[PDB]
Amino acid sequence: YFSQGFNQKWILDMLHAITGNGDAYLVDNSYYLCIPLAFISGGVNELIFDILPQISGKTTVKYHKKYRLLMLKWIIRFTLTELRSTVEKLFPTSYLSPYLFENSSVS
Amino acid sequence: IKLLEHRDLIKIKTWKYCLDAIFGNIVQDDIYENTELLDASDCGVDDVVLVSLLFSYARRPVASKIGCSLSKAAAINILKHHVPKEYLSKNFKLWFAALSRRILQQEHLKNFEMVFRHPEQPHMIYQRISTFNKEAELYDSTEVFFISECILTYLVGYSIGNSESEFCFRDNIMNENKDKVAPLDKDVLNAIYPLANNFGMESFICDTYLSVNEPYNCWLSKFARSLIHQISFNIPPIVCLYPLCKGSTAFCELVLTDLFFLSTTYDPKSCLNWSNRIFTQIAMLLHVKDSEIKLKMLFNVIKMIRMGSRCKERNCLRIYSSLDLQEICQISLKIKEFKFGYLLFEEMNMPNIREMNINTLQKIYECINDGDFLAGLPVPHSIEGVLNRFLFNNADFDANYKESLIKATEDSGFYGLTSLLESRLSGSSDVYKWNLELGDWKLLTPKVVDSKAKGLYYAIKNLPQDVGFAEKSLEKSLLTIFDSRQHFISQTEWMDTLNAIIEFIKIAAIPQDVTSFPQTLMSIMKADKERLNTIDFYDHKTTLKSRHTLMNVLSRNSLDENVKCSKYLRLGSIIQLANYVQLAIANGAPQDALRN
Amino acid sequence: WVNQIASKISMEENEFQKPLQLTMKRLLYKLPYDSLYSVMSILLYEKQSNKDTNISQKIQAVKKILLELQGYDRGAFAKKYLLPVQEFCEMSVELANLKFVQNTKTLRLANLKIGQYWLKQLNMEKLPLPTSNFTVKSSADGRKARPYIVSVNETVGFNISDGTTQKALMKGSNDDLRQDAIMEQVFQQVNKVLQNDKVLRNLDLGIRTYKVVPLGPKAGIIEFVANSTSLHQILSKLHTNDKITFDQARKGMKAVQTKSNEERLKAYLKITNEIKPQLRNFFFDSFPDPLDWFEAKKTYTKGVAASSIVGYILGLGDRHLNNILLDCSTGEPIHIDLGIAFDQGKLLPIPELVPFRLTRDIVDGFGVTGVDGLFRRSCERVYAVLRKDYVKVMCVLNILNQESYRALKGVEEKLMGNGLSVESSVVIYMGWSPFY
């Protein structure tokens, strides 16, 4: 995820670390970590997934989504949210009132 | 609450009585505190747990209660599954006592098959997994909860698809196995590679936990290896198994065992675990070499007992039994009984039933029951006696010239003798028994560790001021009985000690009439008449004598103030004591019938 | 005593029989839900076998009693339960009698085939329970029964409360042939006395268990999954290793034929070679309950500690291992279908010495684990306690020709006699695997 983002900045042990990789096509599954970052990352929103990967196979690009998204939401690392929930609720849901109720509640 | 309460829905009375409180008061004493549709119990245990607060949060305790809302299955839930000790008691514990008699009045083959059934198919594992996921912690916000769901998904999710032909094979057709699991999952389980995200070893687990290495690490069972007895111990035994068949295990087992990094409660599954690991041979005999080496904790022995028990259980199916027939005989026929186990010893006699004794083994045999004649050989022929009644025993004991005679003496009717024979000395921090039979007390206040008849006696004789102030000391005395029992002094049937103090709670103040007072009085008459059960005709004469002492102590302090009630209640008293005698006597020794 | 009430209904309506019948009618009308047996049992045998006396008259009398009861709820409504129950019993009896098709393989079920014993499992709605149990207080409204839930039979394999249930059959069993109901009444007495002694509220044993033996419908000790098996089956199945087992089976035959005496010097004295402690197997392995390995043994032993006194109290015969139950988990052995309630000191060949039967099985059953000599405390108490009430016990047993009197008094003498205190009881006559 982040050394890949560091790119040129990750100049020392990060390059050395390439040698620590398992050569037995670890990447066939291990590359999912970068794709997972793509599911849970933006900025360039490129390179980490697809490109040299692919094989979405419908399922691969789903099985890797739980950890690729079950984290993407978490990635906000934020916590205002109730106010945003009520704003999101503008979509119309009946229970939209619940979002408003949350907005009406103390922080 | 109003928003959803006013949906009305069904049943209503239970939750209505509940919702009506909190904000103010509680009331509904006739009902919620006594004869309401019971909210106390039905299914699960959440009912028995919440109901206590309805007594705690005001309301007249139970008021007089008198009746009930019936029980049956409820009685079971209330006494068996409930037990939420912390603070929700007070009126509720009084309610429990208000139940008392009404409650009492109501009163691995599959693994063995697996042991000698298709070893190639871990069908028992699949059955346990499905059972567990159907009903488990039922939401505790923990990592057990979190992981339980994480792994159920690799099961069924991979099986229903890629396994194709197998698909949680065992009964994944015959009993629609894993259908419930599928309902609960059937999604894109992160590729087993995602086990790296399960916190699991993502590299150690089964590969790392070599069984022989584990045995070597465990060599430090000297003592400092108990730091987690029953925890690291159970886990390590299983970890060893995980390595033993890391390769022989089914596909994607590694994701499971792996993630299971720091996972327990699998103890019931651990029997299936070692049963099919390697299976053919185990020429390490790790469970043999440790015949009795690691002494760090008794639990660990318990697990070892089940280990050994299953080893024999599997053998009896007439299987290969490579470890069992290469295991242990003496020790397996000698040590577990050191502590207990209705099989350490007993089982040891069946394979060991030749011509052998050993005083120590004889002791154990005789100690656990044995029909009071256990191997009753010799003795009489040569030199008899010295075998536990105390009648004669006292002849020769003092013939040459006390506990061996004192209990036996009290059992022979002389309370007037044991009270002198060991009025003090040692072993009897009680002595209360003698004083209660007589009503003397005079022990200052040895209140620490005091129950049954004795607990009643201390509370009973210790009555400051005199009469009129019945309600004040009356409450203190019942509560004392409920709190003393928490040291488990009388634990088993302890709840019956509440009845003696409670009849006093019901008849001590009784300002009503005093001239005729039938209100608690006629009820006691009938209850004692039908007061059959009393465990035995021993406490019947001790807890009862303490109850009689209250009658007389309250009166002793000021029988004259009582005037009109004195006349009636004393008539009621002698009459009931007489009624007691008339329908009693037949229930015990004539010695007591005559002494009183 | 309900079977005695039925037994005693007779022809002398002028006195006693009139109020005796009042009792029978009263109980059948208000609680028919737990009574039928005796009506149907006398009917079935008499119709199939009577060239004698009185029972045929009794049949005509019962027909009139029941004819009126089915028509006297207020009217015919009594029959809604009462006739239906009698008809169900009759149909079942006919079906059992007709089931002796011989065949060969241990199968041939096809459920009921054409019989309405499954096709109509939920036909009589509430399947009146032929046995089982249900009660309220001292009588009260005790018509509340699993019969409602019992309306199930299953096909070519229920339990009223989903529990478990089995049935006894042996390629028939003629209901009409029911006999030795007396032994069953004795079992009722065993438990009855047990409870009469109030100490039962702590004590154990007494046991009993019953079926619908009135119509020869034995209960199957099955479905209970409480380790039941016939005793002779565990024994014949194990009979193998060590020595050879046929050797004593043949000695137990060859040594016997005589026109006077002499058997022990032909077999009893020789079959005693190479005696070592044995078996253990099922009894050791079938219920590994550690804390319960023992409790099961203890429970079993106690049951057997008493049956020794009770069984060997009457002179009840047969037994021969074949009529004894084996069980586990707990387990409480009972006698099955026994008659000839007298010593019978030699049933044809075999000079029986008529001791209580242990036949090695008890000797190892306890000797193996609990060694021996301790059963006494229980047995002495089981026996001695009877003298506390003494006459109370005998007054029932007196009801429950010189040979009958002799045996009865002999039992009284056995209960009392003289020495008592400890006492004892007892070569051997063979045939019945008298070594195991």
From Swiss-Prot, chain B:
Signal peptide: none annotated. It is found in: Nucleus; Chromosome, Telomere. It comes from the Eukaryota. Serine/threonine protein kinase which activates checkpoint signaling upon genotoxic stresses such as ionizing radiation (IR), ultraviolet light (UV), or DNA replication stalling, thereby acting as a DNA damage sensor. Recognizes the substrate consensus sequence [ST]-Q. Recruited by the MRX-complex to sites of DNA lesions immediately after damage to initiate non-homologous end-joining (NHEJ). Subsequently displaced by the RPA complex in a reaction probably involving the SAE2 protein. Phosphorylates MRE11 and XRS2, 2 subunits of the MRX-complex. Belongs to the PI3/PI4-kinase family. ATM subfamily. Interacts with XRS2 and associates with DNA double-strand breaks. This is Serine/threonine-protein kinase TEL1. The lineage of its organism: Eukaryota, Fungi, Dikarya, Ascomycota, Saccharomycotina.
